[PDB]
Amino acid sequence: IPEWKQEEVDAIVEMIESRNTLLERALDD
Amino acid sequence: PRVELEIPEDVDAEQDHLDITVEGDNGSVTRRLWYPDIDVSVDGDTVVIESDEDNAKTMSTIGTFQSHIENMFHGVTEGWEYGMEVFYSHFPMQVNVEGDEVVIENFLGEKAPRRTTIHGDTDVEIDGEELTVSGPDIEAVGQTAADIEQLTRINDKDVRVFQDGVYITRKP
Amino acid sequence: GVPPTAELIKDEAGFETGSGEPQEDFVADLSVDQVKQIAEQKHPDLLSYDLTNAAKEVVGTCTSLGVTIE
RNA sequence: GUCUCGAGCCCUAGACAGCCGGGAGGUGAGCUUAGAAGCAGCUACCCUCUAAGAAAAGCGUAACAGCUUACCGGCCGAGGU
Ligand SMILES: [Mg+2]
């Protein structure tokens, strides 16, 4: 799992609280 | 290996021996698909291309057989169509469809007409400076169009200057 | 409507021609307050939302000319 | 050409290819120059917007314009290199 992908999923989950696969990933969280 | 092709609802595909006939609203096309150990059959609503051998040579043909069958599906329904444009500089070229062959007169100023026979049930429709080769069999259509372009082949002079001729403008 | 960035710098600098080698041959000079004024001018030209980033953009051509800041 | 065997890296958090869409601003960087605006030359090559997008890899123009490359997103879906 490339580090940039894990770090991206974080930034997405961050903006949700306050690639389509990475968005779906952030949603599941 | 085994590849299954689901035949379209518009189509009908019967098969005897090594030959496969594909019928549709746009017509029919029969082909011989013969290669060592590659069995092509019609299992109700799907065409099956299979073999026990999986070597590079076998796989090559299996892929060729697939694309060939898919093209017949498209041909008997949507059809195949090539678009052409007749170009000339000094000498007005007279392109016409006389009988079962397209004839080109006064090409590059020549006295003798150049002609080529149309392959199969391929239809060649001409509208002034535009031509449209069409039919269900992509093999016949593709060649007929090619033949037309090849008909004005010039080997003696510099093509860059002597550009007269009918050319393939649109390919399917 | 607003003139190019490279020109707005040459006014409050007093120098016209740049340099044969940017940063390696310091020509003109500026200050923070000077850059803060040029940042107020360009709004539709710049894509930045804050005035902070507006300054960053202006300070991109500066150093790559010989415009030292104090 | 084809058969066999090994090693490294990539891949369903979607790989390789293809197709579509995006390929943006400060600004046509500065110097050189009548002009040169990614791309005659010299130096530099910095920061905003952002999911990407070079002070531009390749053609192209007298210079522009024009076409793609990088890079990003989508469709596709299994191995790929
Ligand atoms: Mg000669």
UniProtKB/Swiss-Prot annotation, chain A:
Function: Forms part of the ribosomal stalk, playing a central role in the interaction of the ribosome with GTP-bound translation factors.
Note: Has been called L10e and L10E in this organism; in this case 'e/E' is for E.coli-like, not eukaryotic-type protein.
Family the UniProt entry places it in: Belongs to the universal ribosomal protein uL10 family.
Oligomeric and partner information: Part of the 50S ribosomal subunit. Forms part of the ribosomal stalk which helps the ribosome interact with GTP-bound translation factors. Forms a heptameric L10(L12)2(L12)2(L12)2 complex, where L10 forms an elongated spine to which the L12 dimers bind in a sequential fashion.
UniProt name for this protein: Large ribosomal subunit protein uL10
Species the sequence originates in: Haloarcula marismortui (strain ATCC 43049 / DSM 3752 / JCM 8966 / VKM B-1809) (Halobacterium marismortui)
Gene label: rpl10
Curated annotation (Swiss-Prot), chain B:
GO terms for biological process, alphabetical: cytoplasmic translation
Key word Disulfide bond present: no
Cross-referenced InterPro entries: Ribosomal_uL6-like, Ribosomal_uL6-like_a/b-dom_sf, Ribosomal_uL6_a/b-dom, Ribosomal_uL6_arc, Ribosomal_uL6_CS2
A cellular component term, taken from the record's GO annotations: cytosolic large ribosomal subunit
UniProt keywords, alphabetically: Ribonucleoprotein, Ribosomal protein, RNA-binding, rRNA-binding
Pfam family, one: Ribosomal_L6
GO molecular function, one term: rRNA binding
Entries under PROSITE patterns matching the protein: RIBOSOMAL_L6_2
Source taxon at top rank: Archaea
Subunit structure and binding partners: Part of the 50S ribosomal subunit. Interacts weakly with protein L13.
Family recorded in the similarity comment: Belongs to the universal ribosomal protein uL6 family.
Function (record text): This protein binds to the 23S rRNA, and is important in its secondary structure. It is located near the subunit interface in the base of the L7/L12 stalk, and near the tRNA binding site of the peptidyltransferase center.
Protein's name in the database: Large ribosomal subunit protein uL6
Taxonomic path: Archaea, Methanobacteriati, Methanobacteriota, Stenosarchaea group, Halobacteria
UniProtKB/Swiss-Prot annotation, chain C:
Subunit details: Part of the 50S ribosomal subunit. Forms part of the ribosomal stalk which helps the ribosome interact with GTP-bound translation factors. Forms a heptameric L10(L12)2(L12)2(L12)2 complex, where L10 forms an elongated spine to which 3 L12 dimers bind in a sequential fashion.
Family of the protein in this entry: Belongs to the universal ribosomal protein uL11 family.
Its biological purpose: Forms part of the ribosomal stalk which helps the ribosome interact with GTP-bound translation factors.
Protein name, as recorded: Large ribosomal subunit protein uL11
Source organism of the structure: Haloarcula marismortui (strain ATCC 43049 / DSM 3752 / JCM 8966 / VKM B-1809)
Residue window of the full protein shown: 67 to 136 of 162
